[PDB]
Structures are given as C-alpha cells and as structure tokens.
Amino acid sequence: GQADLSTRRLKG
Amino acid sequence: QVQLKQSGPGLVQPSQSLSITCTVSGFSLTNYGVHWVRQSPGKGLEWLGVIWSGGNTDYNTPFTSRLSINKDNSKSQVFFKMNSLQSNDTAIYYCARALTYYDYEFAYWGQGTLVTVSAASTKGPSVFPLAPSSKSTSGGTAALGCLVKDYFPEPVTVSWNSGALTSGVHTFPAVLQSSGLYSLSSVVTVPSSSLGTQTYICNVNHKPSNTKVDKRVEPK
Amino acid sequence: DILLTQSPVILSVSPGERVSFSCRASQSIGTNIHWYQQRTNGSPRLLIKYASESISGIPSRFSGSGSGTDFTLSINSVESEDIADYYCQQNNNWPTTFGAGTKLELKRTVAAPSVFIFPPSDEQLKSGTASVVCLLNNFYPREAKVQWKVDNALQSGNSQESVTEQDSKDSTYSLSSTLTLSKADYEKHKVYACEVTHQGLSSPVTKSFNRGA
Ligand SMILES: *[C@@H]1O[C@H](CO)[C@@H](O)[C@H](O)[C@H]1NC(C)=O
C-alpha cells in the first residue's frame, strides 16, 4: 500500500 | 528530444537544506513551466511547486516557507531548494514538464533524485564476487554475481559489462543491515561455456560517496 | 485538498485479460484526471490525460473513462510488460493531488526456482566477515522458504531476504538469501546448506558446499 524506498514501487 | 536531467542522489543532515538542479533540453524554460514532485514513503506522490515561463512561482501549501525554486533560462537550469529537512522528507525528488505551457499534465520527467535525510556519514561499498561454480550451475547455465556491501545511503547502480549485458540480470533491492549500512546483490545467469571466453564485470556506482568499482567475476 | 482513492491497492490478472483501475475523488472533479504508469526504477509515465484523451506513444490497449467522482483506467488485453504501479492525478482543484496507486501483478503458471549457492569470497574473508548467498532464480509464485543449516545446526535470525519485482518478460520473481557470519564462526564449520521449499518443487532442494571443497 505504501511507496518503498529500496524498490521505488508500492509495497503493501 | 525533450529531456530533464537532475543532479545526483545524496545525503542531507537533519535541519540542513536540499539542493537539486534540473537541466533541461529539447525546449526552452522561457516557453514552459517546470514542476517539482516528490515521492515519499509517508505521502506517496506529492506536488511541491512550479516555476512558470516568466519566473513566477507557486508552492504547495505546506512548503510556502521552506521552498525556493529558481532558474537560469540561458543555461536551461532550474534550481530547487528546500530548507529544514527532516527524516520524513526522505523521498525521490522529480522535476517535470507538462504538455502545454500552462497545464499540469506531466508528460516529461527527470530521472529523479533520491534524497536521504540522516545524521550518518556517507560510506562507499565493498564489492565482492559471487563466483560461478559446480554448486552454481544448472544444465549448461551458470549463475554469477556481485555482493555490494556496507554502503550508505541508497542508491547504488549496478550494470554488467558496461551496459552490454542485460539478459538474465537481476539486481535485488537493497536491504538495511543492523549496522545501518545497506547491502545488495546483483546476479546474472550465463551459458557455462562462455565462462572461459567472455569476461564478466559488474560495474558498481555509489554516487553519494563517488565510489566506482568494476569487479571482475571469475570461476574460483 | 481533494482526496483520491484508488481501489484495490493490488490487482492480479492473467495475460490477455481486461483490467480496470478505479480512482474515486472526494468531490466532483469534472474530467480533470490524468493517469500514470510507474515501472521499477522508473519515473511516472503519462498514459491518459483528462479522463479519456490519448497520449503519443502509449499503446492503444490503454484507455480511460469517467466523470465527476468515478474514473476508470482500462487495459483491454493485458501484457506482461504492463507490470507496474498505476496512479491517478486530479487537477480540477489546486493543488493537483495524486491517488495512492494500484499495483498490477500478473498470474502465470507455477515455475520452480533454480537454486544456486555462493561461498564467501576469499576477498571478503579478509574483512573479517563472511556472507553466504543462496539465489532462487525465476520462480512463481512469490512464496518460498529458504532454510539455512551449518553443520546441521538450524540458522535463525542471521539471514536476510530480498525479492525482485515481477519480471516484465516472463512474470517470474527471483530471491536472494544472504546468511551473514563472523569469519571466526565461518572457519569453525564445514557444511553450508540452503534448503529451498516452493510450490513448484515436489520436495525441498538443497544446495550445499564444504568450506574448502
Ligand atoms: C512529516 O512530519 C510532519 C510533522 O513534523 C507532518 O506534518 C508531515 O505530514 C509528515 N510527513 C511527510 C511525508 O512529510
């Protein structure tokens, strides 16, 4: 649901 | 040929300020506004403000007092400056241009600038080979890689054979170790028989510490 | 500010299927909505502007509809390269605001991981640390178990996992497990094993080495 720093994608 | 290139990712200390340059091409700052948008864990995509063709600025409400946007038309440069950064200002910062001069339909984006807010020091990584072996083969296919260890802050770019090798590459998301340093691996699978003919090099670049390492990876 | 709500947060579909992204606004915004695609390591890419209008270079399979508060981004025949996050943006009211996004993942057939193990390099052993890496490559679905054993002792708490986002070509994931040891501990033991469990394996696969060979 939230933006992930390590991924540059949404993660949960 | 419309493009926006931003300055490199970096670390900023708590309460210190953030500066990013957006250099544009394929159009003129005298004809288009440039917008700034960030993307953070806390708030996702968030519009920050804009500098218009004629130099006027609009800033999003929570940024009125700590944001300054300037430009140099001749040098095609837009300058973003934000004061008093806190941890939750850690985000990827983007410049962007709309389709039409007056609008907000963001058709062209900079590559982004990852900004980490922390009191820590920048540290470049060590690169270690993940060597192909018998315990690393699979029906004529060998896996090999690079372990990019103990750096701060994100991000680190990895490529293989100077951009030429892309098929079968996986570069994993960095994980934060208990030391508070990051670590990631990048792997690639190649034909076993090419291990004797082809060289394999991971090109590691940790821009915040200006550390560039090319690690040759060989069978042990 | 206008709140945009995107539902669901996660969409999982098979290739060639139709997929709709929903975006709802907290008050009427006319048709003043734009949609974006964000791939891994990518900047947002504009797909649709003003609810339904086309953008140069965007494949025809992307379209949008809606007006007032209820909007839809549609992909009529989804492709593997559509694996991304999708965002909506409103600009009827200052300031322009963005929805929180919807993740698009693809279904595919079960694919068992290929498993590879890597001893720490002699280079790293000089630094006083040992990393043992276990790679699980090109598998589906995402769920997998990696168990580490050293001389038959179960390892716990001393490994970390990272998983790639879905591959845009073959829709698989890859996973790395790194077991981290002091050099002293490493040189004290012989057999290093990672056991992998996955839906596509009829029984766990173990990859091991003996320190030395
Ligand atoms: C950060 O913290 C401030 C309060 O200090 C808060 O108003 C803001 O919404 C927080 N989140 C982000 C992403 O800035």
Domain boundary among B76, B93, B118: B118
Task: Count other Cβ atoms within 10 Å, centred on residue B168.
Answer: 16
On whether both C129 and C199 belong to a single domain, the answer is: yes
- Which site among A6, A8, A9 would you substitute to test the B interface, given the most B Cβ atoms closer than 10 Å to its Cβ? A6
Residue C103 at interface with chain A, using a CB cutoff of 8 Å: yes
**C36, C52: one domain:** yes
Residues B23 and B40 in one domain: yes
Looking at B67, B85, B118, the residue that finishes a domain is B118
Listed resolution, Å: 2.5
E-assigned strands of chain B?
3-6, 10-12, 18-25, 34-40, 44-51, 57-59, 67-72, 77-82, 91-98, 106-109, 113-117, 126-130, 141-151, 157-160, 169-171, 175-176, 182-191, 201-206, 211-216
Contact B40 A3 (CB under 8 A): yes
Mark whether B16 and B108 lie in a shared domain. Answer: yes
**From chain B, which residues contact C within 8 Å (Cβ)?**
44-47, 60-61, 94, 99, 103-107, 109-112, 126, 128-131, 133, 135-138, 141, 143, 145, 147, 149, 170-175, 177, 183-185, 187, 189, 220
- Closest-CA residue to B146 (of B188, B96, B113): B188
CATH number at residue C44: 2.60.40.10
Interval between CA B32 and ligand 1 midpoint (Å):
30
Same-domain check for residues B46 and B144: no
Query: Exposed, middle or buried, C18 (CB in 10 Å: 0-12/13-18/19+)?
Result: exposed
Ligand 1 atom closest to the CA of B91, numbered from 1: 13
Q: How many CA atoms lie within 13 A of B163 on its CB side?
A: 0
C-chain residues within 8 Å CB-CB of A3? 101
Do C100 and C161 fall into the same domain?
no
Instruction: Indicate whether C79 and C160 sit together in one domain.
Output: no
CA C5 from centroid of its chain's CA atoms: 22
Residues C86 and C183 in one domain: no
Nearest residue (CA) to ligand 1, atom 7: B62
Domain limit, last residue, from C53, C83, C108: C108
Residue C14 structural domain? 1-108
Instruction: Give dist(CA C163, CA A9) in Å, integer.
Output: 13
Query: Quick check: C85 and A7 CB within 8 A?
Result: no
- For residue B123, the one-letter residue type is K
Provide residues with CB under 6 Å of ligand 1. B 40, 42-43, 88
CB B59 within 8 A of CB B81: no
Do B68 and B27 lie in one domain? The reply is: yes
Considering only alpha carbons, which residue of chain C is nearest residue B127? Answer: C124
Domain termination site, one of C75, C108, C141:
C108
Give the H or E element holding residue A4: strand A2-4
User: What length is written for chain C?
Assistant: 213
- Do C137 and C88 share a structural domain? no
Among C89, C108, C127, the domain boundary falls at C108
Reading the block at residue C60, the tokens are 């025809």
For B14, the domain range is: 1-118
- Residues C58, C122 share a domain: no
Total number of domains constituting chain C:
2
Domain stops at, among B118, B140, B168:
B118
- Residues B112 and B136 reside in one and the same domain: no
Residues B110, B213 share a domain = no
C92 plus C53 within the same structural domain: yes
Distance CA B70, CA B29 (A): 11
Position of tokens 């993940």?
A: B130
User: In the structure encoding, which two tokens stand for residue B79, read together?
Assistant: 């300058």
- The reply to whether B112 and B211 lie within a common domain is no
How far apart are the CA of C192 and the nearest CA of chain B, in angstroms?
A: 11
Residues B127 and B154 in one domain: yes
CB contact under 8 A, C116 and B44: no
Residues C130 and C202 in one domain: yes
What's at B164, amino acid-wise?
A: A
| Nearest atom of ligand 1 to the alpha carbon of B89 | 14
Q: How far, in Å, CA of A11 to CA of C38, rounded?
A: 13
Whether cis (ω within 30° of 0) applies to the bond prior to B62 is no
Whether residue B211 sits in one domain with residue B169: yes
Ligand 1 atom with minimal separation from the B42 CA: 13
Are C169 and C189 in a shared domain? yes
Domain CATH code at residue B98? 2.60.40.10
Contact C49, C89 (CB under 8 A): no
Contact yes or no for C69/C25 (Cβ under 8 A): yes
Facing residues of C134 across strands?
A: C117, C177
B114/A5 Cβ within 8 A: yes
In sequence order, what DSSP letters do the residues of chain C get, joined into one string?
---EEEE-SEEEE-TT--EEEEEEESS--TT-EEEEEE-TT---EEEEBTTTB--TTS-TTEEEEEETTEEEEEESS--GGG-EEEEEEE-SSSSPEE---EEEEE----BPPEEEEEPPPHHHHHHTEEEEEEEEEEEBSS--EEEEEETTEEP-SSEEEEEPPPPTTT--EEEEEEEEEEHHHHHT--EEEEEEE-TT-SS-EEEEEES--
Measuring CA to CA, which residue among C213, C87, C105 is closest to residue B106? Answer: C87
B185 contacts C176 by C-beta, under 8 angstroms: yes
Q: How many domains does chain B have?
A: 2
Residues C8 and C92 in one domain: yes
Q: Does C14 lie in the same domain as C101?
A: yes
Experimental determination technique: X-ray
Please check whether residues B43 and B104 belong to one and the same domain. yes
Residue of C nearest to B172 (CA): C164
CA distance linking residue B39 with residue B57, whole number of Å: 21
Q: Do B128 and C34 touch (CB under 8 A)?
A: no
Cα separation of B73 and C62, whole Å? 36
CB-CB contact of B53 with B32 (8 Å): yes
Among C173, C120, C175, which Cα is nearest to C145's?
C175
Using the beta-carbon criterion (under 8 Å), do C42 and A10 form an inter-chain contact? no
Which chain A residue shows the shortest CA-CA distance from C103?
Answer: A10
Is residue B148 located within the same domain as residue B178?
A: yes
State whether B171 and B209 are in the same domain: yes
